[PDB]
Amino acid sequence: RNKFLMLAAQNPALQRVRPNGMSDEPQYKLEIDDEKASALGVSLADINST
Amino acid sequence: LKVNPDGSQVRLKDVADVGLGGQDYSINAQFNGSPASGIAIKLATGANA
User: Fold this and answer.
1) Per the entry, what induces it (chain B)?
2) To which H or E segment does residue B15 belong?
3) Which 3-state string (H, E, C) describes A1-50?
4) Cα radius of gyration (chain A)
5) 8 Å CB contact between A38 and B9
6) A34 burial via Cβ count (<10 Å: 0-12, 13-18, 19+)
7) Interface test with B, best of A33, A36, A38, A44 (most B CBs within 10 A)
8) E strand spans, chain B
9) What are the b/e assignments for B10-19, b being 16+ CB within 10 Å?
């Protein structure tokens, strides 16, 4: 979609070429170390439910 | 799966083997003598073959 876009725009046959959907933004991932989870007496399903 | 009451932990790979296999092994086929596959299509009632 990015090659498509910056290429079709070198193409004197098209204009105003815009992808319709959204662009990836930053999202805050979560890492859960179950090694310290089971080693802390805290289930794992209770964390998720949490 | 578990943590040995004496340090360390037990993993799925310790109790079983893992990997991509068929979702079902019942049906299987070959074409002329070579391993193959295929979808059979039934015509929809009224549709034209």
Assistant:
1) By growth under severe iron limitation.
2) helix B12-15
3) CHHHHHHHCCCCCCCCCCCCCCCCCCCCCCCCCHHHHHHHCCCCHHHHHC
4) 23
5) yes
6) middle
7) A38
8) 29-31, 34-36
9) eeeeeeeeee
Interface mutation target, options B3, B4, B8, chain A, most CBs of A under 10 Å: B3
Map residue B33 onto helix, strand or coil.
coil
The resolution in angstroms reads: 2.7
Q: How far is A4 from A26, CA to CA, in rounded Å?
A: 23
Exp. method: X-ray
d(CA B28, CA B37): 7
